[PDB]
Each structure stands twice: as structure tokens, then as C-alpha cells.
Amino acid sequence: LERTIEERVNILFDFVKKKKEEGVIDSSDKEIVAEAERLDVKAMGPLVLTEVLFNEKIREQIKKYRRHFLRFCHNNKKAQRYLLHGLECVVAMHQAQLISKIPHILKEMYDADLLEEEVIISWSEKASKKYVSKELAKEIRVKAEPFIKWLKEAEEESSGGEEEDEDENIEVVYSKLE
């Protein structure tokens, strides 16, 4: 049998973790993209990168690893949504440190071309996709509000978008929770 979405994401986690451990991750961005493509989990690339690369120093790490993320996120709104779920997960691990920083981290990701305006707005309006507690998901989105307002400029109208997510989200949740 073909491997499941969960299994394939799991293999990508292992691959990326091993690149980091071996000391070559900084020069392995293309190798990681290729492995994600081989495994047909390209859009999940950013979620794996966040888990492996980001901690409480996420703001420095966004600069350092911009190229790794950009290769996935560029012209790929699905990959961008997975980056946002990745961010949810990093905040969950480092809440005291990171919760207050959400709008500034979002701005840094936006400025690095890793997230498009419409993806961020959409994500802000939608329920938790189950990566983190509903309560934390809510709090993250409240903290996002000042940046969302900055994005829209000086006025607040709401967007409304539909997502395109072929693979199941819940499978990726299981892989992440592992």
C-alpha cells in the first residue's frame, strides 16, 4: 500500500531532523524541498521546518532560514497556511515568551515574503485546525489583531475565503502531535 499522509509527513520530519543533527541543515534547503516533493507532502514543508528549526528564538531563526521557507511558501498559499499552523505550535511550546510577540512575528514573516496578506487574514478568521488548544488558538488570533488591522490599513472590514486542502488536515495533526 501507498503510505498515508501521516506516514509521509512523519518521514519528512525524520529527514529534516536528521539534516539538522548532522550539521548540514543550513545548506540543505533544496534537499528538503526535493524530499517533500518525493513524499508528496510539499505543502507541509513549512510545518516540519518550524518544528525542527524554531523555538523561543524564532525571530532570529526567521531571518536565518528565510530561504528554506521561501522555497516552500512562494506562490503556495497552502504551504503558507502550514507555516501559520507551525507558528501556532511554536507559540504553544513557548507561550510565556511568544504570545505577546505574535503581531511582530507575523510582520517579520510577511516582510520576508513568507506569508501573503490574504492568507493571514483568512487564517485569522477561521477556527482552529486542531494543532493547538481552541483556547490558545483564540488567544493567538486576538494577539494578531493589531497586525491584521495594520494590513487592512486604517479601517476594519472582514474578508472571507475558502481553503483548498486536499490531504487531510487531521492526518497532519496526528503527525505533528507525534
The answer to whether 69 and 86 are in contact (CB under 8 A) is no
Closest to 120 measured CA to CA, from 98, 139, 140: 140
Burial class of residue 8, CB neighbours in 10 A (0-12, 13-18, 19+): buried
The answer to whether 121 and 163 are in contact (CB under 8 A) is no
Q: What is the dihedral of CA 79, 128, 124, 87, to 10 degrees?
A: -50
The answer to whether 172 and 9 are in contact (CB under 8 A) is yes
* Angle between helix 77-93 and 134-152 (nearest 10): 120
Closest to 80 measured CA to CA, from 54, 53, 106: 106
Q: Residue 66: in which H helix or E strand, if any? A: helix 66-73
Closest to 47 measured CA to CA, from 130, 138, 112: 130
| Topology adopted by domain 1-178 | 1.25.40
Closest to 128 measured CA to CA, from 76, 174, 84: 84
HSE-CB of 26 using CA atoms within 13 angstroms: 4
Which residue's C-alpha cell is 507555516? 83
Give the method used: X-ray
Q: CB 5: neighbour CB atoms within 10 A?
A: 20
The answer to whether 122 and 159 are in contact (CB under 8 A) is yes
> 73-102 as b/e, with b when 16 or more CB fall inside 10 Å?
beebbbbbbbbbbbbbbbbbeeeeebeebb
Closest to 72 measured CA to CA, from 25, 102, 37, 105: 37
Q: Domain spans of the chain?
A: 1-178
Which residue's C-alpha cell is 502531535? 177
